[model samples]
Target: HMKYKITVETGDLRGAGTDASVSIKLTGKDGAETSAFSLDKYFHNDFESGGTDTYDQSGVDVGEIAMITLKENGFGLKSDWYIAKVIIEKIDEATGFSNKYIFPCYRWVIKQLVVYEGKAILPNSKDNVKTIAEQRTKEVSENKKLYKWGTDPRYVQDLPGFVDAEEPKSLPKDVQFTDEATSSLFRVGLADFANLGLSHLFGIWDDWDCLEDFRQLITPAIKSGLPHAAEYWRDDVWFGSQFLNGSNPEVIRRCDKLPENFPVKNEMVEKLLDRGYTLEKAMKEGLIFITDYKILEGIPTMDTPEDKRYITTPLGLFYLKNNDDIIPIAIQLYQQPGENNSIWTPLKDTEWDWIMAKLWLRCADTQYHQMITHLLRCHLMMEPTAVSSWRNLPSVHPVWKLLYPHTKGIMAINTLGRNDLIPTGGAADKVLSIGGGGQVTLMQKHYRSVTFDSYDLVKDLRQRGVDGLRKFYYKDDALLLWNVIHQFVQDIIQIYYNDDDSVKKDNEIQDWIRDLHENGYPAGSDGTDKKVPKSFENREELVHFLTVVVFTCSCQHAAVNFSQMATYGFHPNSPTLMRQPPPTEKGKSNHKVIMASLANKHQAVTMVSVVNALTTIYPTEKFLGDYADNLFGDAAAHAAMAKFKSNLANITKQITERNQGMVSPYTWLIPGHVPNSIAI
Candidate 1:
């Protein structure tokens, strides 16, 4: 007779317990196995939340325990369990010999599930009987039935695809957020009411006559005491800092050469630059940076309250002075250079004119940030890859195990937003200049230009031809994270994928990336090229792409998503909806023009509340490098994971120590603050 011991662990989360009937079957070497063995105690309840239960059984000798097949039978009114792990040990009576095996599971379960001795296994992995190998292969087939794909094309085919379901709740148990996570998100959404004043809720604020009055009235009225944006909203130094470390930090690139469209002669910014430095010489010195909102060129604006809302295509230029003061030197309100599209500059020195130009440019950034930078780039862009991994890759596949946690709740939040937030006549329509299908149009337009290469942090900087600018902290901190993640991913990949042929031989690996480009991004009418690889040709290609996926989901999403309330909370700093048109000439704008162009109290506060949800990091959220699921059974992979945390630890101190001296420190990239996935 075979003697065995089984132990099960249930997670500590809310509603993690189960009273359902559970049974197990043990499998061992050379196809040796035992029949179903009920795991129960007549007088006691098993599998309670944050609890563990152990059961012992003796049966026909199954020489050594290699795997256990667990089945959940929904008996009576008992609920499902958020199971954590299971352990099985084989025993010998007289000699006192024993061997233990571990199977890790960190998701909810309702049906029959198989747990291998070692937590990880690929389809190609082998054993004496190939039990684990065949199990992995069968898993990929079973997953096809459970997690199917269909882009709610009726909602909008242009956006990335999601699962086929009537609603987000109808999706699989693992994809949905926990009951605890849902409640936390809700309280914080309404929690914005406390941040702003009570009376301000019912009142529609009037236009302020000057900066002093706006600050005096609204300074004390915020979620926290006072934000960095609230203090430096009008400062030129802070304005330049936003391009480097704002909610939308992706757009700024070094101005390698002066552009023809923006006609800023040396004489315009002569005073801002050193005495001998010409505009041409500044570009050569790599001290000039420029950002263009060409994507907003022809995007639609909200309708008439005397043609109430407007959007601009602004091209702004900055120069890094020898004294380390990086300030805006010139701005053109519209793309095409003409008499009406004046190049607004500080040297023109019509005080409010320069300020008003900056405000209008801020509106342009608002649309770009919401549509392209945060949503499309960070959240939605990863959906197809998320779906591909869930559907095509087997649950036991190392690639899937590596990515599953990072992609948790990604589909749920996006599907909710698709139906609730960004659609026509939604919060986006209420809060942004791009309304009445304009948001969708902008998303689709920029969607074509994005490629897998765009996510590579250093490659993107080099491709944009940017370098040698002072205090580009976003790039600096991001590079540290990129290298660390690249090494970690590379180590893991080398363990699973030995060579180019291994990658090619893996059928599921090819299927995932092929689906990513073909179905994820629509081939738009622009005739522009989109090059998401259909297959991996070599190890280098696979490493680079995997690094991009992990980095984008964690670092990129956190920086863009969490920094919103700080940027938009003050409303005047980065207005989402401009009430008036871009200035036709420099002298035309004044304090009145600036105030008139700002979002009204209703929209401003409403925008803040919406931002309140996006910017928040819920209490239950997990940070990067904090894996709840110990899916990697390999020794080297675990060591690499440990090394990753230590490197992130060092990076954390480096950022904290450096931030001590910074006037307006950037903390969004702090590893501890960044969530493990795009949960928010």
Candidate 2:
């Protein structure tokens, strides 16, 4: 047995703030009590106003602090002990007597305890503790240098400063129609009709027997002088079957034996033969659809007036049946908004009319009004107010006025506060100013980003010339652009979703709001000026909408669109290139290089420039403040916004360095050279 001296360091007491006697017992490995001590004598008069107090206990027999068990069986300790496990009891103030066993609402707060043999060893001095903290601070300061560019610290100070690169004076000229014709003839055919064949190749209806049934279904519509409607059915049956099984000579020869009295023109038949609906190439293209206007007669026309009969056209068709609902079809009739005609134009169209006209006609009709409005509103940036106004027109009578209000209500709930084009104008302005005398203005609206005049940027790029754009496209440069875009998206998701602390704080704030509501206090309403606690009842909806507006609508749209514009020059073919996969070897699966011609280096430079400008002007901090102020009121919104912004800023710094050429953007797969079997 050895005599030991013990010292207890008291910290701030939490619950009931009065000093009380604390009894402590130390037990050995065999569960026998080694020593018992009381901290009553050493404690200050009042423990409520917390201060450190040390109590020394001698003659304690213990092997080690880690091995011995400490029991805090003290009087007057009711609440949980923070930083310590000892119980405390209250003393009678009137009698001036300490209560030994009465448990009160007070607690014994112990910060640290030290026990040593023989004599009391005092803890470190204030100066000694200060020195340790200072050393840790100095170490952290030194470690920060590792984050900066370059390895050699002594010579790193002499590294070249960043100088902004000069923007090119000229843009690439639009490839002439003749030039498009001269380029790979395979590319032209792939662009124009590959999608149509690909759809058929992958379609569920593959057998020749099924093809015959499809022909029978449309034979009557054709004989009734609806050749366009019949053409749709014939194309799907014939072209689709050819694509699925055309590789075999038997399948090819079978398709050649068409009905002798087939209504299709000889020119059309010859064109199909020239195109040669093969399987491999068709697998990489877009799907084809022919409008069957006759199917419209089968649909229920509850609200549409008697005179408002459904008209079937080549481009407009009731293509799908979803239970009681009939989904219509319209393909991309014009590649660019104003280009009257292009080499890639659909062959089966009339002079001035196209699929868009059919869509407008369907949207104007009362029967399909709601469906059309939803499609346009979600994808094309059309507002609910605009849709409502169209429905309210005196000439346009709705089948159900009550249903119109309900639809309007749904749209308002979905998209009221969200804007697609929140960070738009400044980026284009900065790009135009830096890249010579060209003027360009990009627009961002609710969920959609587009140029003010679609052709303006195209014309500007043409003026820059091919040689100017060619300088940016080198080996590994395309990969670098891809990495930059990828990093930006990753950063957005991390700031919003993956961050632990940010998510915790957001939940805590919401809980606080719920508490306020429970206590009969009013909370800020979302997208409305009214202050009512009931508005916050649907907390999940509010939070989800806010996240979708910020990340999906604004950040994601900007990043993806900018990437597309950079890879493929602004043209009709640009969208087509977006879906094209990178080239790879026949048997290889793991090490595919990004061979998609959707993006080039000049477009990459443009992307970086635009991103840098947008990040500089409309940062996450500004957007968060705007979001918070609207959702929550001015007072407590600042703290939440600050935390969110800090996380965002950390990621944006990394992205900004890559975009500004200060850091290498290439991933390990495309490191400087195009090697064989590079890991994707």
Candidate 3:
């Protein structure tokens, strides 16, 4: 025989006052009922005042007890009671030793007689929790229009009715542009387009003069002050050129044609062949333009043997020789050391090889012309010494200085826009795992497709005119869209960190990163070494990094891409001067219900600030003056400088008024989760 002590913690009563009485009865497997004791008597108050109530039994058989029940019996009216948890302790009869068991029943409603079998568990054994969640998701999706901001009880905040009702005044359908304004706008738009496209294709490699040439090519038109130059460039250089606007088939054919000749007769090719390059491999490698390793300083690199050093270039892989000469060899990819030794493998039939080949071939013909134009744009629009890397550029740079205040908002947008790409692990995985595979798959799809497609949006804008463009923007309603998703993400995080007992504390996020580092997760380490950096020295840093990871995968990608498209409409998927919807059905549409939920109205407000900043700064005469001053000195461009200052002042005043009352989305972000510091 053993004595068992049972304790029950009553949470807030649902409707009961101080007059209600609550009691518990325990039953043995043999169908014998333990005496029911009044919880109100134990606590010396009505069950309306909820608190812990404990009961003890002197003697009992260990295997006999099977179930417990809570009964509510008030003197006047019956009201519901709630339980937080129940604890059962078994005491050994002879040794007087005890073992305790806890069963969690957080905020469980109690009315009449509520029973709990020993086998009973949360979510109830009979309920398909996963199916329920799926059904809920479906309900939200199918009934999106049924939800509104202020009126709906499901929302976190009730926005003013005018927010939904207010619409910007429509602009004229045939909005004419002055030659100078058109020229300036076209120049800025072209430069922005080229910069983004090249950056995507080559990353840092554009720094080595490819970007400069494009800048130079666009300068003469500005200097010549030709009235129709903007229209000419737009029609001829952009839309007319087959090299820039050709079909995918033509691009593929060009790439194939460039590499038709087998292994270019060069000493570098001969040396590489001797070092194990096959003829087929050499032919493919001939297309890549190799540069010296010294040029790639400050970038991450793979560890290679002393006898042979290799580096990856935008074009392809290059190898260093004993004489310090760098030679572009066959397409070679660096394979990290593991059970096998590190070596360079031929980049055949790989995604990298395919993308690199296409990008390289497309740029080959217009490289010189595009580089000149890019250089001219840079000279006319920015400080010559300004570092092209947005992350590393100093605040002193005119562009960076102007944009610095809004950096956090920009980063948030950048981080959250591509949420689908981040892998699930640690706390995120734990929460997501609860939903089962169906929910997980649905979430994956939702994250991937919910955001506006950059190419699709741009094409729609061009074809639809200003009215159509406004309609597209309204359809996107990115501010509201991200706000709803942001709430969902926060709820999921709370579920994992606040609700889940297994997750001990918020520090469990750091534990996840530590596990990944220890388990040889590839990207966790520096390029040469297999060790992750100990940068997360404190809780704040860890939380910030994790937050960045989350938002980067979620919102930032969408925000940055959408804003860029809105400003320039430059993407490979769209024709240079024309617009077309993306090939996929989902790509042509936006997420509706997910965007309807009312939360973080301020985020949308802040996003408008960023949009205004970009719009005011990028295409204005003020930007051109800053560029002229930096390149030609103050004495050379006094007239341009004065006008620039006046324009800047007016723009600043307009922006201040525009951003009034707009709150940054960062304010709504979980504190200590995202680091105070910013990163690209």
Candidate 4:
């Protein structure tokens, strides 16, 4: 027997140390092993939190510690324990020499926790180690039982694959929100909203007394200072800028030619342009942009029979001015042209009409922002691939492990969203213009048209013709991160898939893509998304698609979801519920009429409450490239992730320096602030 000295270090975390008796068995390099031995000492307590203990065991020569089996006396006091690392020294009797091996087990030992060396292994590296490979298989099989394709008939349209549990507690301990996150949900999300001093404003349907009263309503956390969005809520320049930077920045596209229906005759807009540029010249010079909401035209609003919510499918035309300023050139409150559908432009003769038209158009953009851009494109768009991955690929697949951290919380949050937020009487119905069925309809319609290419930052900006515009904050910041992400994903993918044939040969990967096409982006009544590929053709195709997946999970969700509070916190800026329809004629209305037409104080407070809840950044949240679940244990992947994290740190510095120069910092894309996935 060899005298092997073993040292155990307990984690310093709260409740991490154990008082129960501990045992261990060590395996060495050449398949040699030893019997399990207890780590108890008489008249001495071992495994104290933040303390280290050592023991000597007479055992067969194992050469080195490759694996360990740690246990507790299951029924004893404080039977739960956390182990940091165990260092073993092998003593050679002949030479009086020793060698040491450190096996890291930085996890809690519930009853029996088997751990190996700190190095994490992938299947391809050494499946020769039969036990580890079998354990991996066991884990994935157990995961299938924990996560499943939920079957609730109410949401046949709901995206596939979410947690099967009834509540968050049933979720895997790793998947559930950390204690810090739970505290944040209450502290900032719930408590801060109440402490905002808006308690006086909470109710069902009380209108703001007038424009001044609504304006006087305090900005959130200023009862807790302020943005910047509320004061400029009515500015024309601010409104135009919002199209490029606001909650719904994706809508505006450069107008190369006027749509057949939107007839902007020269006489109507000659004065709005600069001295030399006409409307035609503006459109020709890439100065004109359009936001068309035709899909929302005929959709019905919720609570409609009585206390009806209003939705206006609006067409807005914007002109880019000197020094990067964009202002509305023309606004049509509805799609079809008629007597009441008269165009409202920024003209002196129709000042109030212009304000009302812009207001209604802003309202349309608000719901579109949440339902289509935030929910469908970012959240649900990524959901399909995530679901597809789980259903078709094993957790041991490189693709599954590679995408896990980036796709974190999406499945859970989306499932929560569908149950509590997307349903008729949930959050969407409470705050958005087109409450339940309408929003669902809009989401479904948009989902059917989604092609992966539409989300490509460079391609999207080029198509929209806003790529060249100055001060496009979302564009600039998002593109930078996209490039970085593409590189990281490219490196990782290149490492895993050596050639095109390698991708083609991986049946699991093929199934993931096929699953995406069939289950996530299937053809049905609304029609299929023809743009999404049925399967990946090559490594390059897989690389690009995976890049998109990562971008949507990280940057896309960050840009849309995190900006809600600053934009929607002040209700008038982007009011979700408009109390009245757009005016048939604009000159007669006053500020009081404007006040009466918008969300009541009750609705405004409710909207504020909801937005604040959505914006709380949890203390436990991981930022882009900050992988909390290092699922990929390979050294090369670690180097790739480390490089990616370094890149993010650089971007954080870059954005901070650049933001300092701007009047209002565009913070959504700051890598430090951006989460790894579509969480809160």
Alpha-carbon runs more than 4 Å astray in model 3? 12-14, 27-38, 41-50, 58-60, 64-67, 94-96, 112-665, 671-680
TM-score of model 2 (CA atoms) = 0.20
Best by TM-score: 1
Cα deviation in Å at residue 525, candidate 2?
A: 29
Sort by lDDT, top down from the best = 1, 4, 3, 2
Instruction: Sum up the clashes in candidate 1.
Output: 1
lDDT for every model? 0.75, 0.24, 0.29, 0.72
Report the C-alpha lDDT of model 3 over 617-659, residue by residue, as the tens digit.
Answer: 2221222113221221123233433543454444434434544
For model 4, residues 175-220, the per-residue Cα lDDT tens digits are 4544434423322233444666766565546677765465444654
- Candidate 4: worst-modelled 10 consecutive residues by lDDT: 180-189
Error of 4 at 430 (Å): 0.8
Window of ten residues with lowest summed lDDT in model 3:
158-167
Candidate 2 global Cα RMSD: 28.4
Deviation (Å) of 40 in candidate 2: 58
Off by over 4 Å in 4: 1-73, 76-129, 158-161, 180-193, 215-224, 304-306, 384-401, 530-537, 628-633
* Clash count of each predicted structure: 1, 25, 38, 2
Alpha carbon deviation, residue 569, candidate 4 (Å): 1.8
Tens digits of lDDT, candidate 1, 1-680: 77778887766543434455567888875568899898652213543346677888788667666677877755655556566888878774446689777777776667877766654554554542477666666766787786667746654445566666665677777777664344233222334555555334434656656654444324455445456788888889889888778888788888887677888898889888888888989999888888998988778888855335789899999888777667899998889998888888888759888888888888888899988888888788887778888767866677887887788778877766676667775668777888767887888878766666687788888776653455778888889999998988888888888788878877777878787767665554554546678788887888888888888889999988888867876777888888777777657777776778887656566676677667666666788888767677777878889998999999999999989976678898899988878877
